[PDB]
Design an enzyme around this catalytic site. Structure first.
Site, short mmCIF file in Angstrom:
data_model
loop_
_atom_site.label_atom_id
_atom_site.label_comp_id
_atom_site.label_asym_id
_atom_site.label_seq_id
_atom_site.Cartn_x
_atom_site.Cartn_y
_atom_site.Cartn_z
N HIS A 1 -7.81 3.95 5.76
CA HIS A 1 -6.80 4.34 6.74
C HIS A 1 -7.39 5.34 7.73
O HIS A 1 -8.11 6.26 7.33
CB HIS A 1 -5.60 4.93 6.01
CG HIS A 1 -4.41 5.09 6.90
ND1 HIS A 1 -4.30 6.10 7.82
CD2 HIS A 1 -3.31 4.32 7.02
CE1 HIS A 1 -3.16 5.96 8.47
NE2 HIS A 1 -2.54 4.88 8.00
N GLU B 1 -0.19 6.41 4.14
CA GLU B 1 -1.38 7.25 4.22
C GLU B 1 -1.11 8.63 3.65
O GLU B 1 -2.02 9.24 3.08
CB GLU B 1 -1.90 7.35 5.64
CG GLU B 1 -1.03 8.08 6.64
CD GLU B 1 0.22 7.34 7.07
OE1 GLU B 1 0.16 6.10 7.26
OE2 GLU B 1 1.24 8.03 7.22
N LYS C 1 0.82 -1.21 0.00
CA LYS C 1 0.00 0.00 0.00
C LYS C 1 0.84 1.24 0.00
O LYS C 1 2.00 1.26 0.42
CB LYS C 1 -0.90 0.05 1.23
CG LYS C 1 -0.15 0.14 2.55
CD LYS C 1 -1.05 0.03 3.78
CE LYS C 1 -1.93 1.25 4.02
NZ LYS C 1 -1.13 2.46 4.26
#
Ligand code: CAP
Ligand code: CAP
Ligand code: CAP
Ligand code: MG
Ligand code: MG
Ligand code: MG
Ligand code: MG
Lengths: 126, 467, 469, 126, 356, 228
Positions: free
Chosen positions: C288, C198, C195
């Site tokens: 998130h 954030e 990923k």
């Protein structure tokens, strides 16, 4: 309970909800202009051009938001750049109102650092 | 043998505590009030905050070597102990401008406050201030209009603006909303507004409200000859619904909408501010939820940062607190963030909670809105605190007047104008305020009724959010 | 012709209208449990009534317009107040809100009422929202999560074990091509997912669309190499809704499986829009919880994460970070087990030993996959499997990119550890008692795992817990 | 440093990174199915249909997200509803692999309350 | 024609039995998207009835289990499967998830068998916008056929969907859900033949016609009459089949009748005899209730249909010899034998309400 | 729980007369007339089954899901007084069976196929209990009575309307002429006949424009808000 009349009760922005300004009270506002170094100016309008209206929106698409006619009035002479004398501001008030005795007349002042009108009130009603 | 990849954990302070760093004028700076766990020194805490808000994780990664970690890393560059506290420190962190997405408050918050508040190694953390450099300020559209433009569009000068939240908060029908609005506006208020939680509900659907409120705005404007507005709430569950509501306001030609920027969120708020810029709508911002974040001194985000964030994302108005009303806001704290909201350049001043000099590089100023538990006897204090560039809102202070909304509005308008005249004549509103209001209560029967009902009502409590 | 109840101007106590201790809550009411700390001299009943009033229908002085409507129908009601044992000025105040107060399908509206203004009242010193009872009739007004756990496993064709992810590191500062390089090497070693951090959105060092394309190349390379479906949560978080949607559209057009959104920093209005987009276009949505601990860390003030998790379930997300319990960020075991059930399950009974103040009926809204991430490594694997079971994604960012042999070996180490713990549990081994032995045996067997075991053997995160029940 | 080979190193999801399951280890997994009341099922695929692929996306517009060919395999008989005997499951593994000795064969189990496959692993590779 | 008159106090009961739709009014309709010939040509399927199957349980299956069931049905020899009429989008299975897994199943079964496959994906929805979103997704997946519940969705939405299907090449299966609310009783309502004409006009490539012999009512002569009205170009008045008016369709495409509901392998001869080749015969319970699962269930139905078709072509009288034809095929095909044994004694024989 | 192929009675799964209905269940009351030889319990069960989850023979796929969770349930049957072969069968449907906001879907289950079963002679749906949790999934009416009165500014009496006549055959301009004359005499509303859509004698857009003229003329003349 007293009822606030909706009839013939149009107002004129700052100081319309107070008793009519006396000559001393007007003079005090002119002092405040001069003490703060603001630029005095007079504006006037005939009765038909004095109150906000919407006629020009006939020419518009969907863009009337915060467009109104009659926010601009007509400038008396020029803003009194460099004026630090209340006599001169009061003299023009008399001059403007004598020349246009049937007009609405307002005294405004500009701040050139914020670049905005920083005070204003009606000085003559037809 | 050059520095090689060394797998394993090391202290964050080895990389991210850099007390000899010379801050750059494009760096974003943060001031964090940190409370370390026992056994974790302040430099390690500050370095952990810097690392985990910028480039670093809990163990050394090899991929650092492909880039320049010194170019990108967040840097804890100074730590000061907090006076009166044996375990609170102010950690100063510098973030290179390359870390941030241009024009995105969302991104800025995601770095600086995204994960660090939950670290086990700290007991509490509060973001007190952010230095937003001009080079980053310039990446934002900012507010749709700002104070000067707003006054110019409204044609309103020389006094505070007056508003009013319609009451009951919830439960009124659309037509009763418009009825209340007309009666308020016609008595001398410049604005009314939807309560922050009035969106669209079974008792009143939004489009019905917008139409009846439009009727009321235009009736009161025609009656008074003064430009009127009502902040119609575009806050919604989805961005598509938010935009539908803004479009309807545009198509009715009305002047102003509102948005709850924290409960709707920064991504939606920024979109709405851009729409308002492009379509000429004023945008009133309600700070619903802020006190969840900003109330406690030891943990959260101070309101001044939430206010800077809103200025960046975009809003023509933002609630500022009242100081003297029902919700908390200490005077010096409030004066400081009002300057941060309105002014172009605000020098560091720790006595008003301003940790950094802030240069807004000509981004428009945001009109502070003082609202909540205020009435006519607070008028002198409000005018003295805020000056003319503020909107003072009286919801219960208008709809609780004995004679109804129009008289209630007139009372507030007379009070404001009396205070404004008195100040212009050289009277000290801090000493003579009570006398100014008393004289005006004598003269105006509408004001007198308000004066009598609320004479003894004060809100005086111990302050939680102290400097 | 004796006069009935009329309008009387002036201030009266909120408790005369909003403290209703004999109220029987309705099954459609939204219920709130507030941990309230009144100022000295403010009776708890009045403080609770103030919170009920100013989150529903009331203001600080009596308004005449109440008489045009029915305050009985609409008012919030403080219906119960209980002192907190061990606290001399702390109370749990329970408030019931009629369902008519809320906009259908709008988490934004729900929060605006319940937490909009009351936390700033001068008359209280602190306020924390601990729980909300979201009745089925209000749950049913939400689209909810795009897919939810069963559908996600079905789309990925992945069953029988926790999913494994990994945040790419350095958080910021990597180029688009180096991002894809790192992702390929991670995914090919056995991770299901990688990923974007954030805060990786679009920046000078790496613009988003460049990243999306190189990550697509990496996903498809690792999927072809391994034969297992792969994903990388591409971050759609953005400054504006238009930018967010552009990023989701590009993921759609690349055919990739999963995007992510920072729901609190982007916000509920954008999040709900994005969830609806993901439902309509078949994208998994990883959520998130950036910024949550600003709100949820302290016991005396803010909003407990369990409420933030319910709110996300309603607004929509296929995954939501849950904490790890044992890693670098805080999350006490019992607290965490409680809100994991609230995230995943259909029906969760009241249980104050796990911080569940209300029975919660989700009325078939999909369950959200809990993501355990942050400061975890191979030695935590038994504890993670024991805590979460199979319906979780366990993420190892530093615990993959910090492996001494690189990302593929790092990924393999985590995958071996997870499968060894899963097998051991399935064979009847108690991971709470035998976890160390399970990992030690797997370390012996797998050279990739042994290298991870050695580097992180002494690394633990054990601190005093702030968010205690 | 050992390098993880990219060559001829395809995997088959759960338990693919462990040593090949012994008969005892397979039997233990079957016991776990039965202990939890789950529904055993066998599935199989020829080599050409065993690996995830993308060929049907030629027929698509921009809707390939989470579409792959070859996630579905072929069912061996039916799910063993009501089966609580591990020896019956093991016998079906033998029968399936006897019938399709060249196929990939996996043992899965279903939970009807979550309505999802709750376990699965490969039991035969060609 | 039916707006207000059925509620007049001056009558006790009213039933619309038939409508003569003149060519000049027929020609104002787009009509069916494709119609029988075009459908057979697109599918490349000739010489026998088409075979379909409703997935079961009606409700409660997940999207992935739906696709699993579909793949196993299609791969055994069914041409089509379908969403149940009430499978739209629900908590247990959202529509787009189902569409994607069904697409996988269609393409897997088609590749495995080498025969064109379809599954009627339901576009029936609460709003026209949702209906159209579902049709668009089917278009973008490249799949052949969708379905719509024309009476519960309504004629306005149905006509729009038919036009979309014409413009985008999708076959449109029409389910007649709710028709028996209107059409069951002899003294009041609207006969199904009128509802069938109305559908032919609004547009549909398939329409359910009843089975005659299955679980839902449909008398033979009534059914033969409205099947002609659905399929044929020109149908003469014939009161013995309930045809009150000569009907000239002026080349509007014919609609494929779909026989479905409570039928199994032993009904195959009767179905082929009643309908001939231009019908789709659907076995939902009759496939997913086979003891060996869906692929064997599909194969049993396909064998039964092919054996009946071959027998008919060879000169055998299916009305007299149907049981013999099925018994012979049972003995040969193990999959068919298992179906024959389970449903050997199952018949649906009740007094008919909708009599001429 | 093994799969057993073959036909069994619907009542073994779908007749549950001790079921306690949930407050989120949709409930139906069916007036049911069974065929001779079909017990009411089996007829009610067939209605429940074939409007929810069941078909005519046992399917193996039931075992992949939970029929307890999803099945429609005939939970009560009462004989109708005055009738020897009519019963009220009550069926409860889990809320999960229904598409949010779709009346189409609700009707497709509850009235889709069951009225045509050979095993019954007649069936009438008398009532439905729409639970709040399902009501809340619908947008519902655009405005509703209070809002309508508020938009029209009309209070204190019934509203008055009028269908224009002849039903069909009037031109657009004659339609507007008729409308103006009706509205100006004191009717609040006029209306198109239900079958006035767009036709050779009067195309819709022509009618809309002339009706607009008539509405505005009557409104200006009377000072009362008008509509058509
Ligand atoms: O909901 C309310 O309470 C208000 O409408 C004020 O009502 P009254 O005028 O009747 O008090 C305002 O939203 C608050 O001022 C918000 O707080 P803040 O400005 O501090 O954000
Ligand atoms: O930025 C980080 O720190 C992470 O990428 C983890 O990094 P590592 O895997 O390298 O630790 C995750 O975002 C945190 O887990 C978020 O916290 P939470 O899950 O508690 O919301
Ligand atoms: O829901 C059902 O019952 C079916 O799916 C058939 O299932 P089985 O194949 O399992 O019977 C069909 O929709 C009916 O045939 C419709 O009735 P009709 O064709 O008369 O309109
Ligand atoms: Mg408010
Ligand atoms: Mg991260
Ligand atoms: Mg059906
Ligand atoms: Mg009529």
């Amino acid at each position: 309970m007293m009822v606030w009349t909706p009839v013939n009760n149009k107002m004129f922005e700052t100081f319309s909800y107070l008793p009519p300004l006396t000559d001393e009270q007007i003079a005090a506002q002119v002092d405040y202009i001069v003490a703060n170094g603001w630029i005095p100016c007079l504006e006037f309008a005939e009765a038909d051009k004095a109150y906000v209206s919407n006629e020009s929106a006939i020419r518009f698409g969907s863009v009337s938001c915060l467009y109104y006619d009659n926010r601009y009035w007509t400038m008396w002479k020029l803003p009194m750049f460099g004026c630090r004398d209340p006599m001169q501001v009061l003299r023009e008030i008399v001059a403007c109102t004598k020349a246009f005795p049937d007009a609405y007349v307002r005294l405004v002042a500009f701040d050139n650092q914020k670049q905005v009108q920083i005070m204003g009130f009606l000085v003559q009603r037809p | 043998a050059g520095a090689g990849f060394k797998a394993g954990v090391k202290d964050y302070r080895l990389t991210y505590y850099t007390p000899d760093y010379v801050v750059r004028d494009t760096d974003i700076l943060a001031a964090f009030r940190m409370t370390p766990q026992p056994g974790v020194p302040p430099e390690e805490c500050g370095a952990a905050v810097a690392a985990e808000s910028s480039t670093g994780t809990w163990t050394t990664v090899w991929t650092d070597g492909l880039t320049s970690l010194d170019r990108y890393k967040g840097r804890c560059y100074d730590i000061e102990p907090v006076p009166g506290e044996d375990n609170q420190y102010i950690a100063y962190v510098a973030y290179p401008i390359d870390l941030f997405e241009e024009g995105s408050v969302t991104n800025m918050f995601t770095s600086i406050v995204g994960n660090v508040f939950g670290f086990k190694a700290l007991r509490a953390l509060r973001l007190e201030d952010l230095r937003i450099p001009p080079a980053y300020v310039k990446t934002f559209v900012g507010p749709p209009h700002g104070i000067q433009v707003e006054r110019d569009k409204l044609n309103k000068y020389g006094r505070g603006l007056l508003g009013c939240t319609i009451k009951p908060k919830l439960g009124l029908s659309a037509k009763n909303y418009g009825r209340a609005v007309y009666e308020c506006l016609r008595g001398g208020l410049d604005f009314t507004k939807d309560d922050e939680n009035v969106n669209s509900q079974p008792f009143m659907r939004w489009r019905d409200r917008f139409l009846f409120v439009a009727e009321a705005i235009y009736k009161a404007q025609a009656e008074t000859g003064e430009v009127k507005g009502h902040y119609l709430n575009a806050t919604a569950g989805t961005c598509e619904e938010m935009m539908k509501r803004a479009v309807c306001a545009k198509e009715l030609g009305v002047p102003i909408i509102m948005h709850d920027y924290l409960t709707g969120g920064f991504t939606a708020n920024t979109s709405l501010a851009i729409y308002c810029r492009d379509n000429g709508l004023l945008l009133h911002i309600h700070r619903a939820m802020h006190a969840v974040i900003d109330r406690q001194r030891n943990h959260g985000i101070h309101f001044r940062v939430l206010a800077k964030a809103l200025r960046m994302s975009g809003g023509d108005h933002l609630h500022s607190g009242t100081v003297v009303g029902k919700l908390e806001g200490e005077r010096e704290v409030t004066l400081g963030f009002v300057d941060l909201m309105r002014d172009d350049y605000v020098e560091k001043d720790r006595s008003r909670g301003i940790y950094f000099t802030q240069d807004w590089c000509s981004m428009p100023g945001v009109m502070p809105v003082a609202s909540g538990g205020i009435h006519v006897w607070h008028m002198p204090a409000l005018v003295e605190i805020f000056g003319d560039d503020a909107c003072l809102q009286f919801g219960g202070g208008t709809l609780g007047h004995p004679w109804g909304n129009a008289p209630g509005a007139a009372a507030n308008r007379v009070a404001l104008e009396a205070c404004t005249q008195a100040r212009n004549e050289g009277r000290d509103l801090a000493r003579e305020g009570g006398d100014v209001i008393r004289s005006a209560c004598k003269w105006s029967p509408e004001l007198a009724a308000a004066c009598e009902v609320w004479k003894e009502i004060k809100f005086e409590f111990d302050t939680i959010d102290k400097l």
